[PDB]
From a paper:
The DNA-RNA hybrid–specific S9.6 monoclonal antibody is widely used to map R-loops. We demonstrate that S9.6 exhibits robust selectivity in binding hybrids over double-stranded (ds) RNA and in categorically rejecting dsDNA. To understand the specificity of S9.6 for hybrids over dsRNA and dsDNA, we solved crystal structures of the free S9.6 Fab at 2.3 Å and its complex with a 13-bp hybrid at 3.1 Å resolution.
The heavy and light chains of the Fab are covalently linked by a disulfide bond between C219L (L indicates residues from the light chain) near the C-terminus of the CL and C134 on CH1, as evidenced by the disruption of the interchain linkage by a C219A substitution or dithiothreitol (DTT) treatment. Hybrid binding does not induce significant conformational changes in the CDRs, suggesting pre-configuration of the paratope. While CDR-H1 (denoting the first CDR of VH), H2, L1, L2, and L3 are nearly identical between both structures, the loop of CDR-H3 is more extended in the absence of the hybrid, with Y100 and Y101 in the loop shifting by ~4 Å upon hybrid binding. This more relaxed CDR-H3 loop conformation appears to represent the resting, low-energy state in solution, as two different crystal forms with distinct crystal packing contacts exhibited the same conformation.
Residue numbers in the entry:
A (entry chain L): 1 to 216
B (entry chain H): 1 to 132, 137 to 214
Write the structure that this text describes.
């Protein structure tokens, strides 16, 4: 099959910067009939891919001018002249010149932006969750950058390693930040150490960890 | 406007078969080609093949011959794909997509069908409300705990609240997925205990408001 190699794999860009994605095929994407059926697709987080460029250089209905495509034979480039916060997601080249049709592996476009501290909110277990016999303490860390963060849960000041589930969103399409949810799961120890439940976050925006807690 | 509405089972046992559908609208179905694309979770795109809906001719990626069968119903403008003898390597999102000019590239894509191949049975999620009276901004939570399989759809006030929402991708632990969503609203609102996130787990037919 025709290999489609996309370079780079991950491309961190600042808003306004230009962005260049390359794609190289193991075989000429020039069909016998003289046409070069090379497309670019964009997949944003949680959505289907959308056509950006067809036939190497043609922009598809409603695609901004800042998206340009060029190349010939085996070397192609997609250029985003001025990058916008909504431009993040994964860019794939695709060749329809030779069966089987093949996509590149994808270039994750990522936005560089200024650091941002997380907004932290702790939550006690639901009343319904307790009637069921469980106890999950939740901790949201919203709108921070970069995604690099550490969360430590503390029960009566002591630290608990087991029973935590963390999850990060994809990069936000407007403020280019991330958010994270951290969950602690207990059953009845929640009444054993019923006081001093603490969610402590350490991020590069401060030498001091950010604390949110509750006891009763 | 072109619409590609996909549907199909989201959880199937290994060795079983599944048939997905793609109901097209907004254009003359029988004059075009339909492509199908596969995307494993967290991975790239793979072309499965296409069906010429005018003459029902098919063309497959060799890798999917004997795994995929493309068919269509011209009376209802619906394209189908059957996957046979499924394994965990077939767990993926499957997209149909219209070829407007020929049979070599696609413009409009369906929203995809999420397919999990597994012996584990469906499991309804427990939806739990998350409440704090802290400050003039308020963040309430919705914990959707212990469900299987993916996906779920979560909304707040029937999609009325959009901006200040973060839904976090589900995580699998204990062989069950746990998802959560937070919502931060202006002072021009209340911290209503159960501001009503809307959880839907079609795999188990759960539609909850809590």
């Amino acid at each position: 099959d025709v290999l489609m190699t996309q370079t780079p794999l991950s491309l961190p860009v600042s808003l306004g910067d230009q962005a260049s994605i390359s794609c190289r095929s193991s075989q000429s994407i020039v069909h016998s009939n003289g046409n070069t059926y090379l497309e670019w697709y964009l997949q944003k987080p949680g959505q289907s891919p959308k056509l950006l460029i067809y036939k190497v250089s043609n922009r598809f209905s409603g695609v901004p001018d800042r998206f340009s495509g060029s190349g010939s034979g085996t070397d192609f480039t997609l250029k985003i002249s001025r990058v916008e916060a909504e431009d993040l997601g994964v860019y794939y080249c695709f060749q329809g010149s030779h069966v089987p049709y093949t996509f590149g592996g994808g270039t994750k476009l990522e936005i560089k932006r200024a650091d941002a501290a997380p907004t932290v909110s702790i939550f006690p277990p639901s009343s319904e969750q307790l009637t069921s016999g469980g106890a999950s303490v939740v901790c949201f860390l919203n709108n921070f950058y970069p995604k690099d963060i550490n969360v430590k849960w503390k029960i009566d000041g002591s630290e608990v390693q087991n029973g935590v589930l963390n999850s990060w969103t994809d990069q936000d399409s407007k403020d280019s930040t991330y958010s994270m949810s951290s969950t602690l799961t207990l059953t009845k120890d929640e009444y054993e150490r019923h006081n001093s439940y603490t969610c402590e976050a350490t991020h590069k925006t401060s030498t001091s960890p950010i604390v949110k807690s509750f006891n009763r | 406007e072109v619409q590609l509405q996909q549907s199909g089972p989201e959880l199937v046992k290994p060795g079983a078969s599944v048939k997905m559908s793609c109901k097209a609208s907004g254009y003359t179905f029988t004059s075009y080609v339909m492509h199908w694309v596969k995307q494993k979770p967290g991975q790239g795109l793979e072309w499965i093949g296409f069906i010429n809906l005018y003459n029902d001719g098919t063309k497959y990626n060799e890798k999917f011959k004997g795994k995929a069968t493309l068919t269509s119903d011209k009376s209802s403008s619906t394209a189908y794909m059957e996957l046979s003898s499924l394994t965990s390597k077939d767990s993926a999102v499957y997209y149909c997509a219209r070829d407007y000019y020929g049979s070599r590239w696609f413009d409009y894509w369906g929203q995809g069908t999420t397919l999990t191949v597994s012996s584990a049975k469906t499991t309804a999620p427990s939806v739990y409300p998350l409440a704090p009276t802290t400050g003039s901004s308020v963040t309430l939570g919705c914990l959707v705990k212990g469900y299987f399989p993916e996906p779920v759809t979560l909304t707040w006030n029937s999609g009325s609240l959009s901006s200040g929402v973060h839904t976090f991708p589900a995580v699998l632990q204990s062989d069950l997925y746990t998802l959560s969503s937070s919502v931060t609203v202006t002072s021009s609102t209340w911290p209503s205990q159960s501001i009503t996130c809307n959880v839907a787990h079609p795999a188990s037919s759960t539609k909850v408001d809590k």
